[PDB]
């Protein structure tokens, strides 16, 4: 088992920031009014954008064949964010109905999937770094 040095690994750092943001959304979805919904989702969105940008900076230096899989995980993150947004809307619309719990529950699930798929990106990026490491 061989871990990577993450001292200046900005992708690693951004994934962590993103996960911390989902954990926050997770722990405070209870003490939040229908207005606080957009706040926590936005925070997740902003840290996602930062993560994806750091990956884009990286992409040109790793071999061209890793770009397929990695762009694949990036698109999966968009789809996950779009889903978190749909579930935010449903929660705002069912704010005073009896489907409020089910909506916020689906919000936690969607953000959860986003965090896990951010990890999937990191593994695809680590795998590309390490493949290329023994290329030449």
């Amino acid at each position: 088992m061989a871990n990577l040095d993450r001292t200046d690994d900005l992708v690693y750092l951004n994934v962590m920031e993103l996960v911390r943001a989902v954990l926050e959304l997770k722990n405070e979805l209870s003490q939040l009014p229908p207005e606080g919904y957009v706040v926590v989702v936005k925070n997740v969105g902003l840290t996602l954008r930062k993560l994806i940008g750091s990956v884009d900076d990286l992409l040109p230096s790793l071999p061209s064949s890793s770009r397929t899989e990695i762009e694949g995980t990036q698109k999966l993150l968009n789809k996950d964010l779009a889903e978190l947004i749909n579930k935010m809307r449903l929660a705002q619309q069912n704010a005073v109905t009896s489907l409020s719990e089910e909506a916020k529950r689906q919000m936690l699930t969607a953000s959860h999937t986003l965090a896990v798929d951010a990890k999937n990106l990191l593994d695809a990026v680590d795998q590309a770094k390490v493949l290329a490491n023994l290329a030449h």
Partner: peptide
């Protein structure tokens, strides 16, 4: 990846 794996575990316990 030690610090992240611990965050990923906390994420599991949130569930």
């Amino acid at each position: 990846m030690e610090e992240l794996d611990a965050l990923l575990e906390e994420l599991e316990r949130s569930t």
